[PDB]
Amino acid sequence: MASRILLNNGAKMPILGLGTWKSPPGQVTEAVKVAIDVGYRHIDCAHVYQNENEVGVAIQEKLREQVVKREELFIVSKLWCTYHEKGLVKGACQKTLSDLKLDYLDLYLIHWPTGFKPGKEFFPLDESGNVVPSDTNILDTWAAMEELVDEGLVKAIGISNFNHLQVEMILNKPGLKYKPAVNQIECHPYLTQEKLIQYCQSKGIVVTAYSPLGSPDRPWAKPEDPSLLEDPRIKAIAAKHNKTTAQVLIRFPMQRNLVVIPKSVTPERIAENFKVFDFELSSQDMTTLLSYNRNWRVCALLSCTSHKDYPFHEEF
Ligand SMILES: NC(=O)c1ccc[n+]([C@@H]2O[C@H](COP(=O)([O-])OP(=O)(O)OC[C@H]3O[C@@H](n4cnc5c(N)ncnc54)[C@H](OP(=O)(O)O)[C@@H]3O)[C@@H](O)[C@H]2O)c1
Numbered sequence: 001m002a003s004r005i006l007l008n009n010g011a012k013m014p015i016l017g018l019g020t021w022k023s024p025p026g027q028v029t030e031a032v033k034v035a036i037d038v039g040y041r042h043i044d045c046a047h048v049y050q051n052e053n054e055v056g057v058a059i060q061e062k063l064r065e066q067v068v069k070r071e072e073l074f075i076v077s078k079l080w081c082t083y084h085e086k087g088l089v090k091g092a093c094q095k096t097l098s099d100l101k102l103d104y105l106d107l108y109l110i111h112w113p114t115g116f117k118p119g120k121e122f123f124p125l126d127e128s129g130n131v132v133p134s135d136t137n138i139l140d141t142w143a144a145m146e147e148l149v150d151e152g153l154v155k156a157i158g159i160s161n162f163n164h165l166q167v168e169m170i171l172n173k174p175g176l177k178y179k180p181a182v183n184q185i186e187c188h189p190y191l192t193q194e195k196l197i198q199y200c201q202s203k204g205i206v207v208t209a210y211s212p213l214g215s216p217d218r219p220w221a222k223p224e225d226p227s228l229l230e231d232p233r234i235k236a237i238a239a240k241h242n243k244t245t246a247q248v249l250i251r252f253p254m255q256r257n258l259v260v261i262p263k264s265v266t267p268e269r270i271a272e273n274f275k276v277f278d279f280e281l282s283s284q285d286m287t288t289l290l291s292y293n294r295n296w297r298v299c300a301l302l303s304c305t306s307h308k309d310y311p312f313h314e315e316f
């Protein structure tokens, strides 16, 4: 398996990266350092994860140690919902860059299509339990993202949690300068996303799969929720290969020509999770895992369902 995939901006993106949502500041510097040591080159970051400073320390240390050079790293971050106004986008990106201690990002994504009220809080809600939106739209934010490419701050721009009609709005934008390079979406055996994946691949847009292990540390996990890592049918495939269930779950999107970003702050798991280039899931494994789709999301974000740009009402 080739370890990078070609983007529509000409750059090559590593198909297996390290996720950092919920990685505590106190553990993420070691996590990123060990990830780089064992071969990860792609780190998936976000301002809202509130640990970009500590990710930055790790990257800077590995550059100083001469373990990697900046050109070999693929660093991704995301524009948070409260910064969709055009006049706020450059500062949001530069805050990330300054916290990461980088002078460019390889990829910058609109984190969610939904703009939130600008201000200090990240998840502004009202007394009904619903998010407080901003008067921003997808096209104007996308234009602001384009400016970041032209000023040299990011090498590629993309989107996350966009449904196919929202992607099409950008592809159809009057005077579009850069197509999205990537759509990062939830994807795993219980949410296999065939239709949205087909749409994006048909357009030349690479898909990144998030929460590939089913995000068992997500704050809202409930005991009755299905659990990928404990699913006996996936254990049985793992057993056949003398691999772990996580390893099966990571290799699965790889063989669908997706990028995947499993998260861990545990050095042993970080190393295990990267050890997926030495086996192949069979055609039976692959189709059996696809057959487990339930269209079930760990990231539904029910607090956002009234937002005009909530992405998961459409079929895909
Ligand atoms: N764009 C967005 O809207 C969005 C949304 C969600 C996630 N993401 C990205 O996708 C990344 C991955 O998703 P996620 O963080 O939700 O969850 P995930 O990667 O599906 O699962 C992470 C969890 O699995 C555990 N784990 C990791 N490797 C393991 C292994 N080999 N064996 C057993 N347990 C293991 C981790 O524990 P420890 O860390 O304690 O080891 C943590 O509890 C995120 O961190 C983020 O970068 C993006």
Ligand SMILES: COc1ccc2c(C(=S)N(C)CC(=O)O)cccc2c1C(F)(F)F
Binding pocket: 021, 022, 023, 024, 025, 048, 049, 050, 051, 122, 219
């Ligand atoms: C800004 O929002 C944060 C920030 C940090 C987290 C964490 C982090 S990294 N911690 C609570 C720190 C720690 O585990 O020590 C874990 C789960 C959700 C988070 C969230 C979330 F909003 F998802 F709840």
Ligand SMILES: COc1ccc2c(C(=S)N(C)CC(=O)O)cccc2c1C(F)(F)F
Binding pocket: 024, 025, 026, 049, 050, 051, 122
């Ligand atoms: C779970 O909710 C958390 C958890 C942690 C944070 C942090 C973090 S990661 N900490 C204060 C640092 C730490 O816990 O070590 C920063 C800002 C908002 C958070 C939030 C918040 F929801 F407020 F956004």
Ligand SMILES: COc1ccc2c(C(=S)N(C)CC(=O)O)cccc2c1C(F)(F)F
Binding pocket: 021, 046, 048, 049, 081, 111, 112, 114, 123, 124, 131, 299, 301, 302, 303, 304
């Ligand atoms: C779009 O709405 C979102 C999106 C993400 C969050 C998160 C985050 S940071 N995640 C689910 C992780 C991510 O989006 O990468 C945490 C708490 C509330 C959220 C909300 C919301 F506030 F509305 F519930």
Ligand SMILES: COc1ccc2c(C(=S)N(C)CC(=O)O)cccc2c1C(F)(F)F
Binding pocket: 123, 219, 220, 300, 301, 302, 303, 304
């Ligand atoms: C653990 O901390 C949580 C947990 C859940 C939320 C939510 C909710 S209820 N969800 C993300 C669940 C959902 O909307 O589906 C919205 C905003 C902030 C949250 C936070 C936060 F800390 F960010 F305030």
